[PDB]
Amino acid sequence: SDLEALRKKIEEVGMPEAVKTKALKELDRLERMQQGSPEATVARTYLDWLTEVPWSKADPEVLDINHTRQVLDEDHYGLKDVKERILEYLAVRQLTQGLDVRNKAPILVLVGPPGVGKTSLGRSIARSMNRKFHRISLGGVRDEAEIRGHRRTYIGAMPGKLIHAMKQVGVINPVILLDEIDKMSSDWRGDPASAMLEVLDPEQNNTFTDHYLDVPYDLSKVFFITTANTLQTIPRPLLDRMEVIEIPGYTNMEKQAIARQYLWPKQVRESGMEGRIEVTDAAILRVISEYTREAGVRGLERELGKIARKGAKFWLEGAWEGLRTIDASDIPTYLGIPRYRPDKAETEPQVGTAQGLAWTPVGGTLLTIEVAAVPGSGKLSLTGQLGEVMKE
Amino acid sequence: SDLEALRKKIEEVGMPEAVKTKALKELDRLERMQQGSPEATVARTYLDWLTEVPWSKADPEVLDINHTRQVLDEDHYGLKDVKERILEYLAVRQLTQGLDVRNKAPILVLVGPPGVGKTSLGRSIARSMNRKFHRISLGGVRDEAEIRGHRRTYIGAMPGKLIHAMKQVGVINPVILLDEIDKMSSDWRGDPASAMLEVLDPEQNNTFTDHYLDVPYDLSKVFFITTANTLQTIPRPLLDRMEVIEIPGYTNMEKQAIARQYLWPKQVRESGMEGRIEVTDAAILRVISEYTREAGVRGLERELGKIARKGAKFWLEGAWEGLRTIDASDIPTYLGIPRYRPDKAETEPQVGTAQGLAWTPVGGTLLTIEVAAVPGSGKLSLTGQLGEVMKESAQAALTYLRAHTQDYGLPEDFYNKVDLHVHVPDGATPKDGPSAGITMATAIASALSRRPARMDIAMTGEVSLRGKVMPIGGVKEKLLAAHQAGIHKIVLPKDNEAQLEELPKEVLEGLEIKLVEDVGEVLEYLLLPEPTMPPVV
Amino acid sequence: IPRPLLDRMEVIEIPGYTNMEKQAIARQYLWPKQVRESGMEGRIEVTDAAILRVISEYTREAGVRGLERELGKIARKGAKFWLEGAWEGLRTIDASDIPTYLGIPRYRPDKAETEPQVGTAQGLAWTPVGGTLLTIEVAAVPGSGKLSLTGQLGEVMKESAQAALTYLRAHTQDYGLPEDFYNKVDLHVHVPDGATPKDGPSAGITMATAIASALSRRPARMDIAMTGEVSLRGKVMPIGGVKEKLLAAHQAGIHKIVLPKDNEAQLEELPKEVLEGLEIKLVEDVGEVLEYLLLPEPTMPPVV
Numbered sequence A: 001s002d003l004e005a006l007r008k009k010i011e012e013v014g015m016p017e018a019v020k021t022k023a024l025k026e027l028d029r030l031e032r033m034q035q036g037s038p039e040a041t042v043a044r045t046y047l048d049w050l051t052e053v054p055w056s057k058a059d060p061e062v063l064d065i066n067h068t069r070q071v072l073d074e075d076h077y078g079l080k081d082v083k084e085r086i087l088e089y090l091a092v093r094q095l096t097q098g099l100d101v102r103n104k105a106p107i108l109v110l111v112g113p114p115g116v117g118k119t120s121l122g123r124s125i126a127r128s129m130n131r132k133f134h135r136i137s138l139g140g141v142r143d144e145a146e147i148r149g150h151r152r153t154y155i156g157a158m159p160g161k162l163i164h165a166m167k168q169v170g171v172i173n174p175v176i177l178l179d180e181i182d183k184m185s186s187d188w189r190g191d192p193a194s195a196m197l198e199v200l201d202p203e204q205n206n207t208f209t210d211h212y213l214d215v216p217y218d219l220s221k222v223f224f225i226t227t228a229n230t231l232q233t234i235p236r237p238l239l240d241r242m243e244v245i246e247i248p249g250y251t252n253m254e255k256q257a258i259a260r261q262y263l264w265p266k267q268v269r270e271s272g273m274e275g276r277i278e279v280t281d282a283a284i285l286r287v288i289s290e291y292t293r294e295a296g297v298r299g300l301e302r303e304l305g306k307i308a309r310k311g312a313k314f315w316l317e318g319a320w321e322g323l324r325t326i327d328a329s330d331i332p333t334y335l336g337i338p339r340y341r342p343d344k345a346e347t348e349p350q351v352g353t354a355q356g357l358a359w360t361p362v363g364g365t366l367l368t369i370e371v372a373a374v375p376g377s378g379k380l381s382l383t384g385q386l387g388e389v390m391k392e
Numbered sequence B: 001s002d003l004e005a006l007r008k009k010i011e012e013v014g015m016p017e018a019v020k021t022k023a024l025k026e027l028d029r030l031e032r033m034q035q036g037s038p039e040a041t042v043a044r045t046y047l048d049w050l051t052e053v054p055w056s057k058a059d060p061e062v063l064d065i066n067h068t069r070q071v072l073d074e075d076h077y078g079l080k081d082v083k084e085r086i087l088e089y090l091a092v093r094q095l096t097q098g099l100d101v102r103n104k105a106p107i108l109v110l111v112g113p114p115g116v117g118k119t120s121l122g123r124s125i126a127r128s129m130n131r132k133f134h135r136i137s138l139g140g141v142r143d144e145a146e147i148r149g150h151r152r153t154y155i156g157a158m159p160g161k162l163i164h165a166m167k168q169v170g171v172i173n174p175v176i177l178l179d180e181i182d183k184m185s186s187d188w189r190g191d192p193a194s195a196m197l198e199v200l201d202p203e204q205n206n207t208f209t210d211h212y213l214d215v216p217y218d219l220s221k222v223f224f225i226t227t228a229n230t231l232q233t234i235p236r237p238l239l240d241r242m243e244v245i246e247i248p249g250y251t252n253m254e255k256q257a258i259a260r261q262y263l264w265p266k267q268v269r270e271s272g273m274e275g276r277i278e279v280t281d282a283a284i285l286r287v288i289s290e291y292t293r294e295a296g297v298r299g300l301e302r303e304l305g306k307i308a309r310k311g312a313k314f315w316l317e318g319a320w321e322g323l324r325t326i327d328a329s330d331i332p333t334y335l336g337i338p339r340y341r342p343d344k345a346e347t348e349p350q351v352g353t354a355q356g357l358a359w360t361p362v363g364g365t366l367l368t369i370e371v372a373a374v375p376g377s378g379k380l381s382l383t384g385q386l387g388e389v390m391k392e393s394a395q396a397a398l399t400y401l402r403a404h405t406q407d408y409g410l411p412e413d414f415y416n417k418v419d420l421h422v423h424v425p426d427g428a429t430p431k432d433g434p435s436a437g438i439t440m441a442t443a444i445a446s447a448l449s450r451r452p453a454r455m456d457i458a459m460t461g462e463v464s465l466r467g468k469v470m471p472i473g474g475v476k477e478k479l480l481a482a483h484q485a486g487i488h489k490i491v492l493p494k495d496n497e498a499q500l501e502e503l504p505k506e507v508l509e510g511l512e513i514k515l516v517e518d519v520g521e522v523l524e525y526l527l528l529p530e531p532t533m534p535p536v537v
Numbered sequence C: 001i002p003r004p005l006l007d008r009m010e011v012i013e014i015p016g017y018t019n020m021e022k023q024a025i026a027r028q029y030l031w032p033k034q035v036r037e038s039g040m041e042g043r044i045e046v047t048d049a050a051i052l053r054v055i056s057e058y059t060r061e062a063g064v065r066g067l068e069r070e071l072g073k074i075a076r077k078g079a080k081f082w083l084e085g086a087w088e089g090l091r092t093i094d095a096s097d098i099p100t101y102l103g104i105p106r107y108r109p110d111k112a113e114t115e116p117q118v119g120t121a122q123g124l125a126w127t128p129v130g131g132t133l134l135t136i137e138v139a140a141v142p143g144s145g146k147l148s149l150t151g152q153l154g155e156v157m158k159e160s161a162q163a164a165l166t167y168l169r170a171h172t173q174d175y176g177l178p179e180d181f182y183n184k185v186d187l188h189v190h191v192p193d194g195a196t197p198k199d200g201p202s203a204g205i206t207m208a209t210a211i212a213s214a215l216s217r218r219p220a221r222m223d224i225a226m227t228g229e230v231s232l233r234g235k236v237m238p239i240g241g242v243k244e245k246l247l248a249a250h251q252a253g254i255h256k257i258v259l260p261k262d263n264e265a266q267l268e269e270l271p272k273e274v275l276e277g278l279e280i281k282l283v284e285d286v287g288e289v290l291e292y293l294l295l296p297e298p299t300m301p302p303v304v
């Protein structure tokens, strides 16, 4: 009595026409082969993964950009360029009704130094665009199975993660996130970074064929977001499928705002104090200058954590009247000795030494190139752990 | 009862003789096994797999080609050679009755940098001649549960993907698109890379022996097309079976025209727009020249997209009326900041330099080679991240000049009293190849001799130690890069005069190509007659 | 193959075909199959040279498949022309016709130069696909005795180079060499092309011929092609791969080969038809090579 009840489950879901028969012909193949005999499982579970995976259900998307704008502006500061590539996307589809509403979702890749908030976009963009969301942990995957599970004839027979994802979310168009897309390998023990070439291919996405199922699934309408700290290690084909979006890294003036707006209160609101302690804008720079080198702010908040936590001890031993504004002359008492000196700038004309600029993902850095000429033969030495190209 | 239909179904399709008796045998083995069992299913489905696969059921061969051509053109600009490969195929079909079909007939493999249209061709070539198409994604597949399907007795079972394609397709002559065949992974465990060896083999594939359909199948008259953006990773045997076909990327003229016809209108309709905005042709050359550093279009379309997205984001913030055109002036407003440089040909005759043409898959680059001669002791220092091959070529041309010092007006004993330095800007990007020979041979001459070298003329060619000018490779992408810069004089080795017929006839009119067979002609053609600077003294 | 499977067998290698075979294996086997299959019932005919070009020019593999495909392209384009134009009988495709059908060349041939030049010799070298033809050029310019070896030479050949140079440094007067070049002339040896890496000591005497010609300023004949290994005393040593080498020379038009004495054996496996076209000299001491190669009066003035 279950199969016919399962038939109605099949009779309504989706569905692609020929796949329906390609599915019904298996249910009929399960008319016989009595429940019992082991292959019945392989057929049954197949029909489960076949029917549970969503066909023809797209979550009604939001359409007011001004609404979504301030839903983005409430969680992440700056990143104007990223927010537009979303706003532009809505303004495009909003302009489309009746015909060609959900054609494709642009596969973005977000590249930037580790310390900025990239993996926090997908967690936020979802609520913004009001779509389902399920990140895929692709940091270190080294087996061409998590993309396409092993064939249903094997003993495990579980589809790839990219279908699990489609199952967890209920809709056909979720904002699937891929974490650190460049940590995949191309060596022995598979090379999943090559399997992706079938996934992210836009004009050929809608015919994705996992190995567990044998039916072409559709991923034309799915918002693939991609993060990668660098992009000199992405296979050249992949990088020509995605869309590069430069997550720059934050300057002090922008770093300042983030602490002031988001980072500082987020800690306080999670450290008991409802405002009984406060830091001063002028003191913020000290934590930024004398205690943080990394680009971004992951390495900035955990100094506020000390500031917040040390507030507890000083409060838990004994409270005070209202707030106690921490100022610039106070941080060394909380964060201890400054662990990153500010690089001064030399101020008189010197001999054989000139000012040089050098930049890293960490940010800008001053460099004083030093030369000294001594009487001797015709030799040139290049010390200072110089790379090869600079010597040239 | 119900089996009898299936029994009647066997005689209907196909069939080869031996399998027929083989089939009826197992049917007459099935028909006497009782209605469902651990043995019925593992045998019944075999027959329901023998019947569904197509036997000797095919599609016609369209003698009409003017149609088959007039459908290919509406899908892909350029690609003239691949299109011709299909025409000649149909032309053979028209000229043949009562003989083999695919006995050594094109099992194509397309090669070319990513971004060009290869995986977007199978569906086209199928629509060209009405053959039911199917894709087989193979990038990363590293097992044998594929093409050589599992044996029919394991708890589960399924034939190989290939046999599974013939089931999914309806006929015996489909167009299978073995996508990304150059990602075959030989991570120990039976890389199929060995499995295909039987399939692609143009003479033995008519007896492809699966493990589910253990009966021999003939994939002879299938039409394989496998895309692959390299060849080093393909095993040496398997590559042989295929017929390599290169796709050399696109020029600037193609990338321009291909945008006006296919790319841009494709992006308008998807962007909600219909003709509320339209770009100007020259303002696409600006997008190709400055915002695109790749052969192909899978990157270009992502620029026209952002033009369209930005072309609609405005329509909501404020509407307008009539086609809002876009020119070069307006380009940076929509896309962004110039992300690349249109390297300009620089004209005044300089001393100790020389134009140089370098080749790269993405296209040609216009290099300038700078050489300094200063008082010293002959130490020859080569910087600019030169590769090992080029360094050796540089020493060649120099060792040539030290042998003919009197001819080109060089210092008699410069070898002993002049520190010589060669620089190839820029410094970051590594360089290699020996085609830079006659470039340096000029510059080094124009350095030691103070006769400045013209830079209207851009030269290229491998130089031997005797003074012969060897031939080089990739002359088209160089001259294309040349004309785009704005140079109309080229110095070239005789043995490359053959490869001129790939340049567009348009550009060939505005090129004063010179064919030289020895470096002596070049140094007379390049160096200005009378010196202008004092020597090293 | 696992050693249990390997040893319990009779390995019978298959070498890979020679061009002399291909000009025959095509006409007899591949071409007729490829014209029937093409549907062209005999409206087309290929000739020796027309095949000969396709053998060397448009093919760089020891294997008929490569050759076979091209005939498919000659067959197809031999049919696509038919629908656009008929003819009375059949059009015998000749050598000069191939580029019209099979397009622009891919691997140009290697002509055998012809006036004797200064410091030059046509060395032979073989690679699995087949023997090639490598010239060797050397430069003598007043300097500090520097030896510069370029052309992506392998470490073996560079050592063999010094060997020949050491030999001449011993027996200066015997040949026309400047007495004190070793510390006044900088010899440079270049073996084009610059891209293709080169290895192996079998080109011993050819560098000895080239280098000696340079210092002596005497021109060296190029109609002769030589090969072999050279020792310090000058004992020319035997070298393998003769069938692939001499066969490469014959096609290039060379008709005078110089071969080590010990390699008198490998002559037996060459096709007896090609031997009579070759004048093979057997040499044992490099002195017998320099004499046979060099002209007895230089043309370029000395280096000093």
Ligand SMILES: *[B]([O])([O])[C]([C]C1=[C][C]=[C][C]=[C]1)[N]C(=O)[C]([C]C1=[C][C]=[C][C]=[C]1)[N]C(=O)C1=[C]N=[C][C]=N1
Pocket (backbone or CB within 6 Å): B356, B357, B358, B359, B360, B365, B367, B390, B424, B429, B430, B431, B432, B433, B434, B435, B436, B472, B473
């Ligand atoms: B030549 O061998 O065809 C040429 C060498 C060259 C030319 C001009 C300036 C420097 C070197 N080779 C190339 O074009 C190489 C690429 C190459 C190398 C070996 C074989 C084939 C092709 N070009 C470069 O090195 C290069 C560097 N940076 C940008 C673009 N090209």
Ligand SMILES: *[B]([O])([O])[C]([C]C1=[C][C]=[C][C]=[C]1)[N]C(=O)[C]([C]C1=[C][C]=[C][C]=[C]1)[N]C(=O)C1=[C]N=[C][C]=N1
Pocket (backbone or CB within 6 Å): C123, C124, C125, C126, C127, C132, C134, C196, C197, C198, C199, C200, C201, C202, C203, C239, C240, C241
């Ligand atoms: B010799 O060792 O038989 C000869 C060396 C040689 C000398 C001069 C020019 C080319 C080659 N060997 C070859 O021809 C080698 C193969 C070899 C190398 C080392 C030891 C034994 C055999 N082949 C090449 O170097 C070659 C072949 N084809 C093109 C380019 N190089």
Ligand SMILES: Nc1ncnc2c1ncn2[C@@H]1O[C@H](COP(=O)(O)OP(=O)(O)OP(O)(O)=S)[C@@H](O)[C@H]1O
Pocket (backbone or CB within 6 Å): A075, A076, A077, A078, A079, A113, A114, A115, A116, A117, A118, A119, A120, A121, A180, A227, A229, A258, A262, A263, A297, A298
């Ligand atoms: N503009 C911003 N304003 C405020 N907080 C921000 C901003 N950008 C990022 N963040 C914070 O950054 C954190 C998220 O950083 P992550 O995305 O986890 O680091 P990530 O570098 O993107 O991921 P990696 O590279 O794998 S460590 C959150 O605490 C965010 O609040």
Ligand SMILES: Nc1ncnc2c1ncn2[C@@H]1O[C@H](COP(=O)(O)OP(=O)(O)OP(O)(O)=S)[C@@H](O)[C@H]1O
Pocket (backbone or CB within 6 Å): A203, A237, A238, A240, B075, B076, B077, B078, B113, B114, B115, B116, B117, B118, B119, B120, B121, B227, B228, B229, B258, B262, B263, B297, B298
């Ligand atoms: N005339 C054309 N030539 C090439 N590409 C075209 C043309 N017209 C449209 N395109 C599009 O350009 C893209 C070509 O890239 P594809 O062939 O699909 O990918 P690919 O060439 O296989 O590269 P890889 O190897 O898969 S990374 C597709 O999006 C096509 O729709």
